[PDB]
């Protein structure tokens, strides 16, 4: 089997991407944030505290003929940005892009933090990291990908995120029309439950490539590119008037600037992030200070290749017995 779904930016900055997901029978379609940095499929629901729901579409298990309470199971998650959610668990039929899993754990939120409530466009998350990070207790649950894997034509999914445009998540196949050149594969460590890999270096603009090992994660659920402070300082030093602002919470730059590209290495291959991808616009409405898309990972404890990096590539998440990542230009 295979599946193919379109993923759409939630706003004009590509802050996140939503993908429609069918849950239950008859289908309830919710727009979920597919997150390769977490392992819970959780949704706004008929159980969510009413004051914490503001425009999201909710899953109502009582209206699904295939929903079953997973008795005794609870979940609670905290993300890198300080947001959180928790609740109870149902099993139900879940379909993405025509690919169906029966008996998928659907984590129903009873509580969500303010950042979720305030984002009316995101109805929940679909985690695509390794199932070792799943928060369900007392019986850990599998991801949608882990449950689908054995049925797929190939044990893979791909992320093809757009810059200010829709893109695609595919399950079970490589679309050889969706990228240019060849795919360069690189080793993955699953020790922390993430798609963790080692970049071979970077370049700033037209500058020379610096060969250096940068361990980090491929995380579709993180907006920005978080890298070591040395690399980030080298990038922003090429932008006149750029500075790190403790008041704003990272590097800002004049909105009049033209940003340089950023290149990262994947083995002997190179992925180029155009300068425009690194512009996250005014820090507040009407400001002439703009927020940078490359930020320091110091204090986060891990480097994160978030959407700013991933949307410059066609990315293969290879879930074979020995997992690997692939990157191609597009």
Q: Annotated catalytic sites, by residue? A: 35, 199
Q: 168 near 7, Cβ under 8 Å?
A: yes
| Residues facing 69 on adjacent strands | 90
The CA–CA distances, whole Å, from 10 to 89, 166, 248 equal: 27, 10, 23
Contact indicator for 314, 160 with CB cutoff of 8 Å: yes
Q: Report d(CA 320, CA 49) in Å as an integer.
A: 40
> Which residues on adjacent β-strands are paired with residue 105?
91
Within 8 A by CB and 6+ apart from 260, the residues are 204, 205, 206, 235, 238, 239, 275
The phi and psi torsions of 294 (rounded to 5 degrees) equal: -115, 125
């Amino acid at each position: 089997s295979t599946g193919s779904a379109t993923t759409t930016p939630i706003d004009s900055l590509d802050d996140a991407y939503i993908t429609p997901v069918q849950i239950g029978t008859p289908a309830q379609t919710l727009n979920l944030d597919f997150d390769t940095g977490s392992s819970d499929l959780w949704v706004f629901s008929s159980e969510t505290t009413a004051s914490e729901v503001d425009g999201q579409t909710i899953y109502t298990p009582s209206k699904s003929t295939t929903a079953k309470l997973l008795s005794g199971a609870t979940w609670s998650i905290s993300y890198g940005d300080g947001s959180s959610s928790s609740g109870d668990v149902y099993t139900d039929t879940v379909s993405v892009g025509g690919l169906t899993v029966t008996g998928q754990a659907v984590e129903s939120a009873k509580k969500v933090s303010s950042s979720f409530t305030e984002d009316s466009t995101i109805d929940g998350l679909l985690g695509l990291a390794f199932s070792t990070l799943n928060t369900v207790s007392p019986t850990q649950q599998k991801t949608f990908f882990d449950n689908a894997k054995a049925s797929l034509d190939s044990p893979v999914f791909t992320a093809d995120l757009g810059y200010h445009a829709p893109g695609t998540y595919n399950f079970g196949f490589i679309d050889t029309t969706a990228y240019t050149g060849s795919i360069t594969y690189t080793a993955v460590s699953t020790k922390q439950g993430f798609w963790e890999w080692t970049s071979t270096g970077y370049a700033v603009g037209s500058g020379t490539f610096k060969s250096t090992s940068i361990d980090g994660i491929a995380d579709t659920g993180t907006t920005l590119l978080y890298l070591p402070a040395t690399v980030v300082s080298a990038y922003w030093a090429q932008v006149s008037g750029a500075k790190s602002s403790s008041s704003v919470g990272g590097y800002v730059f004049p909105c009049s600037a033209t940003l340089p590209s950023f290149t990262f290495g994947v083995g002997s291959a190179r992925i180029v992030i155009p300068g425009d991808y690194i512009d996250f616009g005014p820090i507040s409405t009407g400001s002439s200070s703009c927020f940078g898309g490359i930020q320091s990972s110091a204090g986060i404890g891990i480097n994160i290749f978030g959407d700013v990096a991933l949307k410059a590539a066609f990315v293969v998440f290879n879930g074979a017995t020995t997992p690997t990542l692939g990157f191609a230009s597009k």
